[model samples]
Target: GFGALFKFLAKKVAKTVAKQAAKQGAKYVVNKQME
Candidate 1:
């Protein structure tokens, strides 16, 4: 459990990606619009 650095990194990366997408004006619009 102590060497779970990758877990934290992964979590941070995932969060960043989501935030980036939304920040970049690309929020829930892709797989959200049933078109």
Candidate 2:
């Protein structure tokens, strides 16, 4: 049960990082498109 909980948390952290990176990249692309 402890292992399962840790795995779940790990996946959540990974997703959060991915989302942050994606948001930053998307903003950059949008700014470029406008120029």
Candidate 3:
């Protein structure tokens, strides 16, 4: 359960970051693309 919760939070944060980056005019977004 802890792992799942952590993953969920991580994903949420990632999405927020991506949104912010896009708003800031990021030409290419690559969040967790390696994984």
Candidate 4:
């Protein structure tokens, strides 16, 4: 089973989520470096 338009939106949402997660992770690392 496959569908159009949905897969495109799904990829976009997935990419945004991953970027946010990576940003949070980078922030944590920066805070750790301040100590």
Could you tell me the TM-score of candidate 4? 0.35
The residue ranges of model 1 lying beyond 4 angstroms of the native Cα positions read 1-3, 22-35
Clashing pairs in 4: none
Question: CA lDDT, every prediction?
Answer: 0.74, 0.78, 0.67, 0.77
Which number leads on TM-score? 4
Better of 1 and 4 by lDDT: 4
Pitting candidate 2 against candidate 3, the one with the higher lDDT is 2
**If candidate 4 were superposed on the true structure by all CA atoms, what would the RMSD be?**
4.4
Candidate 4 per-residue lDDT, tens place, 1-35, comes to: 55775888788877888768866657767878999
- Can you give the lDDT of residue 35 in candidate 1? 64
C-alpha lDDT of residue 23 in model 2 = 65
Tens-place lDDT per residue, model 2, 1-35, is 46787778888877888768866657767878999
lDDT of 2: 0.78
lDDT of 3 by residue, 1-35 (tens): 36787778877877789768757564355554544
Stretch of 10 with least lDDT, candidate 2: 19-28
Where does candidate 2 stray beyond 4 Å? 22-35
Ranking by TM-score: 4, 3, 2, 1
Model 3 CA deviation exceeding 4 Å by range: 1-3, 22-35
For residue 34, give model 2's deviation from the true position in Å.
24
Residue-level lDDT tens digits of model 1 in 1-35: 58887888888878879767757575578657866
Q: What's the true lDDT of residue 20 in model 2?
A: 83
